[PDB]
Amino acid sequence: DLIPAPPLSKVPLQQNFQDNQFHGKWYVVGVAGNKSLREDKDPWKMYATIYELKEDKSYNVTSVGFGTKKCHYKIRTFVPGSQPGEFTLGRIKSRPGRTSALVRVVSTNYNQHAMVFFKVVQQNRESFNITLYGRTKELTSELKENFIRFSKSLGLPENHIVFPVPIDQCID
């Protein structure tokens, strides 16, 4: 089924967020969200996202991943939101048939991991996730446990948590 998004009260914001220290390449090493996830799936492959901070304090955000036979890219702009560490998708008013998103950096140490919360609407359909980012692809058990704990705190069952499989194609 479809779990409702937690209130923002339950989503910490990283105190004193430093946009220029969050810049750079991250691997998506965990994700928990309210979308379905069935068991005869192909495993979800790890991909990377590069946050490039601009002068104007927006990020150019580029993701790269591996499909079945080719590398894929996705590029978009995140602009600052209401508090440091919060961003929204895109520079101008929601283009005719568009997506909108809120992004909140919950925690990060900049040089190892980050947990970032996303609420997305697309074609009037709502979803949310928490993404666990790493500077490297290796995810150790204590951090997996902390992410499972955090995801439960937002109302997500274990079966809505995935740790993407590390791969070498495209993302290095």
């Binding site: 978009r76 998708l89 992004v103 996303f118 993404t131």
Partner: peptide, 13 residues
């Protein structure tokens, strides 16, 4: 389905 399955999901499609 999606290669880009976390973050601003679907924003490319």
């Amino acid at each position: 389905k999606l290669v880009f399955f976390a973050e601003d999901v679907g924003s490319n499609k």
